Design a protein around this nucleic acid. Structure first.
Ligand SMILES: C[C@H](CCC(=O)NCCC[N+](C)(C)C[C@H](O)CS(=O)(=O)O)[C@H]1CC[C@H]2[C@@H]3[C@H](O)C[C@@H]4C[C@H](O)CC[C@]4(C)[C@H]3C[C@H](O)[C@]12C
Ligand SMILES: C[C@H](CCC(=O)NCCC[N+](C)(C)C[C@H](O)CS(=O)(=O)O)[C@H]1CC[C@H]2[C@@H]3[C@H](O)C[C@@H]4C[C@H](O)CC[C@]4(C)[C@H]3C[C@H](O)[C@]12C
Ligand SMILES: [Mg+2]
Lengths: 101, 1340, 251, 69, 153
DNA sequence: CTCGTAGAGTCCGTGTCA
């Protein structure tokens, strides 16, 4: 709506301004009362597919691995390297930016 | 002010003057059911309507009809109270006079016989109580009004989803009140299809063909024709000048000498204007242009007869050439402008395989019941009865009104059945909208939503019963012989009453009355549901209907609705709202005469409301309805803006009209977020009546309206003087003005004492007034449950302090000081009922004796010889209440126990114990006992004692009433006897009956003495007959269920004290659990030494934007400050002068207030009374939105001599050192909610299991365990906790052998296990093996 | 089964089986009678209908029940679907030795314990109490032990205290979104009917003290006790399983 | 997609647990398919020790005793 | 069509219309094979007779779940006629004593018949506004020996 | 290049969750 609510709760709202916020809150409540059902269904499916996975072996012994970088989404580094790599096992030796390190 | 008002006036804030006061709050229910009964001649709303609709019932062409006279309501056999006690439906018998008339065949026209039936009985109809309820089986049920879509025609859009390429496809739905539905929808290719209500898709034109319409007739009725005449040569067109509007020309359009439209340039407005003013009629046209037109009629070779062009054939050179050599001058094509006039019916005709009427009826008949051989007559009758038979298809007066309004016809009232013109017009409107010269309507507009109250639904179900019986009577009237039997054997009453009682009992919308708080009753009766028959289901809809429409303003409350899954479908009715004559929703508005804002009110519906510019209530008015601002704030079409002074047609009646009553009670609503307003309102309606209700310090003014309107208070009908008051009855001496001329006498009000409410709460009425007090008509005699001096007092107001106290109010949890329980101010009384039934087993009837095998005499001590608890004995969990034993033999005991019996000589008792002992953990006083024996069985002594008590009591009461009324009658005879010669000195010493036998001058005066004598005699004889009747009602054996010998009901009264775990709340949505009860000293206390009552966590305010509670606390602190100041001034017993001056200064407090108080009232004593009532704190009244400004609170606080900021320094009760930064303290009105810990707490070790799957039962009556759901299984798997899950899955619930192994091991002090196979899995194996699938357990 | 009140309750399969058997017997007799072709056809049609409703009612004309308009439940309905079975009754059971009640804060608790009402404690641990009562000889037999528990004498409280001393309990809140929705605590007996919960963990439970209720289970076998005490004790789960950060942070 | 992937499990009791039961049952019946349970959810269903966590060793131990002499 | 015409009478005794028509067909065939034109008897009546003789017999026997003697059914019919007449004339209802008056039976069998007529309720009947549990979810299994008693033994 | 056949896309109705 073009015109906003000029008053605040310390002062007093008026009939129509309330009406409007009433609509807002009603929609919000229904929104939650449905995000809960959808989230429940989704998580149930998820656990369904992933049920059997168990850590069975000590070490598979592969040389494979994925190159992890800091996610610099456009303007900046939204999430640094350290948090993305903390607690992961390494695939191979890392060198300083200068060889033989 | 009135005398109840003079008792205690409430200080009112609030600036605008209430023009209309709130109406009678329950009007809807009472007046609607009144309209339902309403014996009236003119067939309007009323049973009469149903009868006249169905009757007269004509024989199967036998010419022996059954005709209707009238109906009569029998008097209920059982009064209300006894009906509640005995578990019967409170109802009236209905009797109908009918006439059977039989003609002769063949007679020279003349009715051979007419015989009249002696008021045949047509069943029982439940009556509504004075408060608007129904007692159906000794429980009060309420029928909530139901909102649903009005009958009529509605045009839906269904945009977007239609193939994901736009294709905005419209559809017209015709909905009748009674009958099948019609639907017209389009298709991707713009072909118009008709479907019957919820069936397959037919080509729409078939219906028009089924209507007996010829193809050419159809296209005539729809499309605008174009004539191609032959004038001197080659097929030239007659032209409507505007017709080409927006159409590129295909040829060179010159006419009558001048080129108008250039060959190739699309016709512009300029050329059209040229032709228009030049008035060019006819144009020669190239034959190629005609190569594209369409053929309207079927032009055959009229000379020879051979057809050339067919119905709905595209025009080609060959056809026009064939016609021109054949010599046909007039060709009729259609005007198909793909922009405006689309080829919709044309395309349907092209796809249209059916041609004749007969083929259409064939398709209908074989579509509605696919597979049955179609017979011509069968199909004709099918269709005729489908849509034009009066009985099956009726729209309504309402349906017709909306229908004609949608098609804008001057006529409001139509014929019930759909005339063909109706359908044709409907499709016309559909295609018009499809072109884009029209708007689609939105179902969610309140103008399309109708409210059906009780009377209408009762009428419908009664209609259904009648149609059943009508077919029945036709069967009996046509086959069987006519003249022997009289007209009562033909009709069976069972199904009618069956249907009505079915509706009243087992329906979604007929629900238990929510009866624990007066607000609960009032709001539950004023509820609007979209559920039920003919309405929505929770799963289908759907956000459209849940959201709040701008139309709801002032008609339905936007803020009150359950937050559960059914949000939006309850939505309680607004305060001032009413129903229109047609069952719509209408609200009052004040008229505006261009300059003056008058006081005449008009009720407007939604549709009319849309038109006008209405100003809001919050507009400043000077002394004669003049607006101070030239630019005022209004809304006209659902949009608010600023409009000039000289434009507003109407104005809001009062500020409150937007909200329901429940929300209307919350103070300072203007400052609270909608969410917490919602939660506050919902919770507030669940408050439980406390022991001593007092009053809200900060109310809204509705308190008296609700209190009076609820039926729990006792209200004066004829004002007078209180002659006698006792804690059971109020006897009022009428004022001579109000005394009826013939037999006025005095008025007696019997009050109701502790009876059990639907939720097990107590409802007790206490007298308010004192001896000799004068009362006026409409005054409040006695306060009902949770009511004070006429005002609604749901809970109590206590001193709260907002501060964190050792994390004991960590979360919304609440701390409480021992002081409250010390004064016992939150103790509730609960009256529970318990039932013992003695049935007939196959081994023999059960017994009630007190002799119970192997019971200790300790528990038997409290039973009489008959085995029933003494009235007034105190019991606790486990004690035995009523002894009962059951026949049981042939035990076939195990050997070792046989050895034991031989050893000790223990004669095994052949009767098992069954006595109804007190439930675990409940302890209270048994207040009453009732015993119901079926007729025939030998009443036990105790039953006889109870009948003796009841008899003598009823006798006593009847004598009581008769004597009081007779004393009043004689007093009035004396008051008349003083006129015409005073003789009271002689009179007072001669006997009382020697006052009627005396004489006076023969006049009207002697006639009035004669009146009073005749009234004395009549009262005597009625007393005698009603007494005898009462003893017959008491004695008669009661009708019990098959198999039950007798029943014992016991009412227990438990006193529940507030304790840790209970739930308490405020009115603003703040909640909490009482976490700890502290000694008085531990509580923080102010410098003055008064300790606070509750310590509430502040961190709940800012995040949950309900700030109003803070202002409430401030204003209440100010009010109690006034209260203390006046109590202090009273304890010093200053003088009338001092109190009067101070009290006036207080009531004044600034300006802009509509209060208008003394000095008028009596000068000394009544002021002292008012001070006595106000010493507990002067009550303030802010209406919801026209409320108290901050500055006014500050000012009043200054009047109290208190810190203007509302904070005080507080000292810690534990250490004695002060708190930094003084804190807000003050009184808030808090509520005790129905969620009581003792009810919720629950545990089981071992108990009953289920029959099929040997799992433990779920529930509370039977112990019942928690449901370990799959989500918890996953939780367990997240850890490596396998053994816990294993035991939980098998030994703990489902494995019987394992569970016993576990019990034995546990008791012996060993902890091992024995997993076994879960029983449910075995069940699964057996169940699928029951199917044709072999399921085996393999092994390797 | 005969429910109290001379009326009877039956599963729908009784009606379905009865109908099928009726149609079977009627067809047998019809064959013995050599009825015309049309009648044998009609009989076989109806028998087919009955069978298919018996196996899976809902893929045809919805054979309703006696006078109740509700469609009767066929075998597949019993198996298939959430409300019916596998989902409903075989991962959604109803355990024994369980309780439920409203929660309250009670800040003074240690991180690894929880306030538990006495009366629930007796109700749950009934059999443990019996065992200890019989072991120490305070009660001659189990029946006398039961009477002694229902008298609620001081000795009963003493034995209950000793059993509760080291025995762990599981506490749960209904929407167990993540694995921390069920956690183990040591019980501490308190008066009243409210369960007392350590504040720091309420954030982990997503619980609020505004009338939210919690369920309480008792691990029975010894191995279960150890599983609870080792893996599920509150103190063992301070870091979120989702990300490594602490969950029990002050609120 | 996770639903289909779930649909393609080896054990038919797993698939029967949450999808169209009739479909999986009929498929498994015609195929004569054999479910060794091998998984977590099946082991839950039959009420034996889960092969995860504390119970992993058990099944692993059982494996040495299983399918041997 | 004759069988169909007569069948529509019996249309509310817990019997799929088609079963009714089938029983009628059996009765009609029986009549036809047994019909005697030389015995002197109206054919149509003979047919309809057998039709009813079969239809009523079938409803009496296989209608109720618990099969009940046919004379008992006739007793119920008499009771129902008498209840209807007395109720519609009196308005209120006839009490079992009044019914015992109207018929000469000793009224012990009156209430016996009333008990017998009660049909079994469907175990799945949904409980009020809580379509989550049915009736089956409540019935408890009394057969189970109590664990306490096993320990005692 | 057209006829007959092959392939791709769409629509309707049903099954499937709360
Ligand atoms: C009696 C009333 C007529 C309204 C009317 O016109 N009153 C006259 C009022 C006229 N005045 C006094 C207001 C002056 C007007 O200015 C004159 S004018 O209307 O403007 O011409 C008609 C209109 C709608 C009808 C009800 C609905 O169908 C639903 C339902 C159908 C059932 O099958 C029978 C019962 C129900 C409840 C109907 C009852 C009754 O049948 C109603 C109320
Ligand atoms: C109407 C009567 C007042 C009578 C009166 O005032 N007579 C005055 C008579 C005066 N005269 C005629 C003798 C002339 C005198 O000479 C006038 S003067 O003294 O000389 O001025 C009222 C006032 C108190 C009322 C009674 C109480 O409820 C208790 C009582 C017990 C029952 O459990 C409950 C009902 C009972 C029966 C009530 C009876 C009756 O309802 C009473 C007496
Ligand atoms: Mg909560």
């Amino acid at each position: 709506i073009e015109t906003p609510i000029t008053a605040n709760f310390r002062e007093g709202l008026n009939v129509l301004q309330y009406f409007i916020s009433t609509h807002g809150a009603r929609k919000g409540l229904a929104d939650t009362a449905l995000k809960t059902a959808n989230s429940g269904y989704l998580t149930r499916r998820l656990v369904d597919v992933a049920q059997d996975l168990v850590v069975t072996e000590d070490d598979c012994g592969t040389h494979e691995g994925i190159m992890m970088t800091p996610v610099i989404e456009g303007g900046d580094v939204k999430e640094p390297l350290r948090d993305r790599v903390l607690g992961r096992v390494t695939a191979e030796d890392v060198l300083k930016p200068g060889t033989a390190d | 002010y009135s005398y109840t008002e003079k008792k205690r006036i409430r200080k009112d804030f609030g600036k605008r003057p209430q023009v209309l006061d709130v109406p009678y709050l329950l009007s809807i229910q009472l007046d609607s059911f009144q309209k339902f009964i309403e014996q009236d001649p003119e067939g309007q709303y009323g049973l009469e309507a149903a009868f006249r609709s169905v009757f007269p019932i004509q024989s199967y062409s036998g010419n022996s009809e059954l005709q209707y006279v009238s109906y009569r309501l029998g008097e209920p056999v059982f009064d209300v109270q006894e009906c509640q006690i005995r578990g019967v439906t409170y109802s009236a018998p209905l009797r109908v006079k009918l006439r059977l008339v039989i003609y002769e065949r063949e007679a020279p026209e003349g009715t051979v016989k007419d015989i009249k039936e002696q008021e045949v009985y047509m069943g029982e109809i439940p009556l509504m109580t004075d408060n608007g309820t129904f007692v159906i089986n000794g429980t009060e049920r309420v029928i909530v009004s139901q909102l649903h879509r009005s009958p009529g025609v509605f045009f839906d859009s269904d945009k977007g989803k239609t193939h994901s390429s736009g294709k905005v496809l419209y559809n017209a739905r015709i909905i009748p009140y009674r009958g099948s539905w019609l639907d017209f929808e389009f298709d991707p290719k713009d072909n118009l299809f008709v479907r019957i209500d919820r069936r397959r898709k037919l080509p729409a034109t078939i219906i028009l063909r089924a209507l007996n319409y010829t193809t050419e007739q159809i296209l005539d009725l729809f499309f605008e024709k174009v004539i191609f005449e032959i004038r001197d040569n080659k097929l030239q067109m007659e032209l409507v000048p505007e017709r080409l509007r927006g159409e590129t020309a295909s040829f060179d359009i010159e006419a009558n000498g001048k080129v108008y439209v250039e060959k190739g340039r699309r016709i512009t407005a300029r050329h059209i204007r040229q032709l228009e003013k030049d008035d060019v009629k006819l144009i020669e046209v190239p034959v190629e242009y005609i190569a594209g037109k369409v053929v309207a009629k079927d032009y055959i070779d009229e000379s020879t007869g051979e057809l050339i062009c067919a119905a709905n054939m595209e025009l080609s050179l060959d056809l026009l050439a064939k016609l021109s050599q054949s010599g046909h001058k007039r060709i009729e094509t259609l005007f198909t402008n793909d922009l405006d006039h689309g080829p919709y019916i044309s395309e349907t005709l092209r796809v249209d395989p059916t041609n004749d009427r007969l083929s259409a009826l064939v398709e209908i008949y074989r579509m509605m019941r696919p597979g049955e051989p179609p017979t011509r007559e069968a199909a004709e009758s099918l269709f005729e009865n489908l849509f034009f038979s009066e009985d099956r298809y009726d729209l309504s007066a309402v349906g017709r009104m909306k229908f004609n309004r949608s098609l804008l016809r001057e006529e409001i009232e139509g014929s019930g059945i759909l005339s063909k013109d109706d359908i044709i017009d409907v499709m016309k409107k559909l295609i018009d909208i499809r072109n884009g010269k029209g708007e689609v309507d939105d179902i969610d507009h309140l103008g399309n939503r109708r409210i059906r109250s009780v009377g209408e639904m009762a009428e419908n179900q009664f209609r259904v019963g009648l149609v059943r019986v009508e077919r029945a009577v036709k069967e009996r009237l046509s086959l069987g012989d006519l003249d022997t039997l009289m007209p009562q054997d033909m009709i069976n009453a069972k199904p009618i009453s069956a249907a009505v009682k079915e509706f009243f009992g087992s329906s979604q919308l007929s629900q238990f009355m929510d009866q624990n708080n007066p607000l609960s009753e009032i709001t539950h009766k004023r509820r609007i549901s979209a559920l039920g028959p003919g309405g929505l289901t929770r799963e289908r809809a759907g956000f459209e209907v849940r959201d709040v429409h701008p139309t709801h303003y002032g008609r339905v409350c936007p803020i009150e609705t359950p937050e559960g899954p059914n949000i939006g479908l309850i939505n309680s009715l607004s305060v001032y709202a009413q129903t229109n004559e047609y069952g719509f929703l209408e609200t009052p508005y004040r008229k505006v005469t261009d300059g003056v804002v008058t006081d005449e009110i008009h009720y407007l519906s939604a549709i009319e409301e849309g038109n006008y510019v209405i100003a809001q209530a919050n507009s400043n008015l000077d002394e004669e309805g003049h607006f101070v601002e030239d630019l005022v704030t209004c809304r006209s079409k659902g949009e608010s803006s600023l409009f000039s002074r000289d434009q507003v047609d109407y104005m809001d009646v009062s500020t409150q009209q937007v909200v329901s009553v429940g929300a209307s009670l919350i103070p300072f609503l203007e400052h609270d977020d909608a969410n917490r307003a919602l939660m506050g309102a919902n919770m507030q309606r669940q408050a439980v009546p406390t022991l001593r209700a007092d009053k809200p310090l900060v109310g809204t003014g509705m308190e008296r309206a609700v209190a009076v309107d609820s039926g729990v208070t006792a209200v004066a009908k004829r004002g007078g003087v209180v002659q006698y008051v006792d804690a059971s009855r109020i006897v009022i001496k009428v004022n001579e003005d109000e005394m009826y001329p013939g037999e006025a006498g005095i008025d007696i009000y019997n009050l109701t004492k502790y009876t059990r409410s639907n939720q097990n709460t107590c409802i007790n009425q206490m007298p308010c007034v004192s001896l000799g007090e004068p009362v006026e008509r409409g005054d409040v005699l006695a306060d009902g449950p949770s009511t004070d001096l006429g005002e609604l007092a749901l809970g109590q107001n206590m001193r709260v302090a907002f501060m964190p106290w050792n994390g004991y109010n960590f979360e919304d949890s609440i701390l409480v000081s021992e002081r409250v329980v010390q004064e016992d101010r939150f103790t509730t009384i609960h009256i529970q009922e318990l039932a013992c039934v003695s049935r007939d087993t196959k081994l023999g009837p059960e017994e009630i004796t007190a002799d119970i095998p192997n019971v200790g005499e300790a528990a038997l001590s409290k039973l009489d010889e008959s085995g029933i608890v003494y009235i007034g004995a105190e019991v606790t969990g486990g004690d035995i209440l009523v002894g009962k034993v059951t026949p049981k033999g042939e035990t076939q005991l195990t050997p070792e126990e046989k050895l034991l019996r031989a050893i000790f000589g223990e004669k095994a008792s052949d009767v098992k114990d069954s006595s109804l002992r007190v439930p675990n953990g409940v302890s209270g006083t048994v207040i009453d006992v009732q015993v119901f024996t079926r007729d025939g069985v030998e009443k036990d002594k105790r039953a006889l004692e109870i009948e003796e008590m009841q008899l003598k009591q009823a006798k006593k009461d009847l004598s009581e009433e008769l004597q009081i009324l007779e004393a009043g009658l004689f007093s009035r005879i004396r008051a008349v006897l003083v006129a015409g010669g005073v003789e009271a000195e002689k009179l007072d010493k001669l006997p009382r009956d020697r006052w009627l036998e005396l004489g006076l001058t023969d006049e009207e005066k002697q006639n009035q003495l004669e009146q009073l004598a005749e009234q004395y005699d009549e009262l005597k004889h009625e007393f005698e007959k009603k007494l005898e009747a009462k003893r017959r009602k008491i004695t008669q054996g009661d009708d019990l269920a098959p198999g039950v010998l007798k029943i014992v009901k016991v009412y227990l009264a438990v006193k529940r004290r507030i304790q840790p775990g209970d739930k308490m709340a405020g009115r603003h949505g703040n909640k909490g659990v009482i976490s700890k009860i502290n000694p008085i000293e531990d509580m923080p206390y102010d410098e003055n030494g008064t300790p606070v009552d509750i310590v509430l966590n502040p961190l709940g305010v800012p995040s949950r934007m309900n700030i109003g509670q803070i202002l409430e606390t401030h204003l209440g602190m100010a009010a109690k400050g006034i209260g203390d100041k006046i109590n202090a001034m009273l304890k010093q017993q200053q003088e009338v002068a001092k109190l009067r001056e101070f009290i006036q200064r207080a009531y004044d407090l600034g300006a802009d207030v509509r209060q208008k108080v003394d000095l008028s009232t009596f000068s000394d004593e009544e002021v002292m009374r008012l001070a006595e009532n106000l010493r507990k704190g002067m009550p303030i009244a802010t209406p919801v939105f026209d409320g108290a400004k901050e500055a006014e609170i500050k000012e009043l606080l200054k009047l109290g001599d208190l810190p203007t900021s509302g904070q005080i320094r507080l000292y810690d009760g534990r250490t004695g050192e002060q708190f930094e930064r003084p804190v807000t303290v003050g009184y808030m009105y808090m509520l005790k909610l129905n969620h009581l810990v003792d009810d919720k707490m629950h545990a089981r070790s071992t108990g009953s299991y289920s029959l099929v799957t040997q799992q433990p039962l779920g529930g509370k009556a039977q112990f019942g365990g928690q449901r370990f759901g799959e989500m918890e299984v996953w939780a367990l798997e997240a850890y490596g906790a396998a053994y816990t899950l294993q035991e939980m899955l098998t030994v703990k619930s489902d494995d019987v052998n394992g569970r016993t192994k576990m019990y034995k091991n546990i008791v012996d002090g060993n902890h091992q296990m024995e997993p076994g196979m879960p029983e449910s899995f075995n069940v699964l194996l057996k169940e699928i093996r029951s199917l044709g699938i072999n399921i085996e357990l393999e092994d390797e | 089964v005969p429910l109290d009140g001379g009326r009877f309750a039956t599963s729908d399969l009784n009606d379905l089986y009865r109908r099928v058997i009726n149609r079977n017997n009627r067809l047998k007799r019809l064959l013995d009678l050599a009825a015309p072709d049309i009648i044998v056809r009609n009989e076989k049609r109806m028998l087919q209908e009955a069978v298919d409703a018996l196996l899976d009612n809902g893929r045809r004309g919805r054979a309703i029940t006696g006078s109740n308009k509700r469609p009767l439940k066929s075998l597949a309905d019993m198996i298939k679907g959430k409300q019916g079975r596998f989902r409903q009754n075989l991962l959604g059971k109803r355990v024994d030795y369980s309780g439920r009640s409203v929660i309250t804060v009670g800040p003074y608790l240690r991180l690894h314990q929880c306030g538990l009402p006495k009366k629930m404690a007796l109700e749950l641990f009934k059999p443990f109490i019996y065992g200890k009562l019989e072991l120490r000889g305070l009660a001659t037999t189990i029946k006398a032990a039961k009477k002694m528990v229902e008298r609620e004498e001081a000795v009963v409280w003493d034995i209950l205290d000793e059993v509760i001393r080291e025995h762990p309990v599981l506490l749960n809140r209904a929407p167990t979104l993540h694995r921390l929705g069920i956690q183990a605590f040591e019980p501490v007996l308190i008066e009243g009917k409210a369960i007392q919960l350590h504040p720091l963990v309420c954030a982990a439970y997503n619980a609020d003290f505004d009338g939210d209720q919690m369920a309480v289970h008792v691990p029975l076998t010894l191995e279960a006790q150890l599983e609870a005490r080792a893996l599920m004790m509150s103190t063992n789960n301070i870091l979120s399983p989702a990300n490594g950060e602490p969950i029990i942070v002050p609120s | 997609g996770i639903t289909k992937a779930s649909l393609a499990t080896e054990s038919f009791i797993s698939a029967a647990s949450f999808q169209e039961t009739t479909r999986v049952l009929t498929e498994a019946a015609v195929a004569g398919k054999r479910d060794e349970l091998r998984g977590l959810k099946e082991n839950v269903i039959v009420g034996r020790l889960i092969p995860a966590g504390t119970g992993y060793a058990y099944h692993q131990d059982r494996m040495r005793r299983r399918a041997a002499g | 069509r004759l069988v169909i015409s007569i069948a529509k009478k019996y249309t509310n005794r817990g019997l799929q219309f088609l079963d009714l028509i089938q029983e009628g067909n059996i009765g009609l065939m029986k009549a036809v094979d047994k019909f005697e034109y030389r015995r002197g008897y109206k054919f149509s009546t003979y047919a309809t007779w057998w039709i009813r003789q079969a239809i009523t017999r079938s409803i009496a026997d296989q209608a109720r779940t618990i099969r009940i003697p046919v004379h008992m059914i006739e007793t119920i019919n008499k009771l129902n006629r008498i209840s209807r007449q007395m109720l519609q004339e009196m308005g209120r209802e006839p009490t079992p004593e009044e019914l015992a008056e109207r018929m000469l039976m000793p009224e012990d069998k009156i209430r016996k018949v009333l008990k017998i007529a009660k049909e079994p309720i469907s175990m799945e009947t949904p409980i009020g506004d809580d379509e989550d549990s049915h009736l089956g979810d409540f019935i408890e299994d009394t057969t189970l020996e109590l664990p306490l008693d096993s320990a005692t033994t």
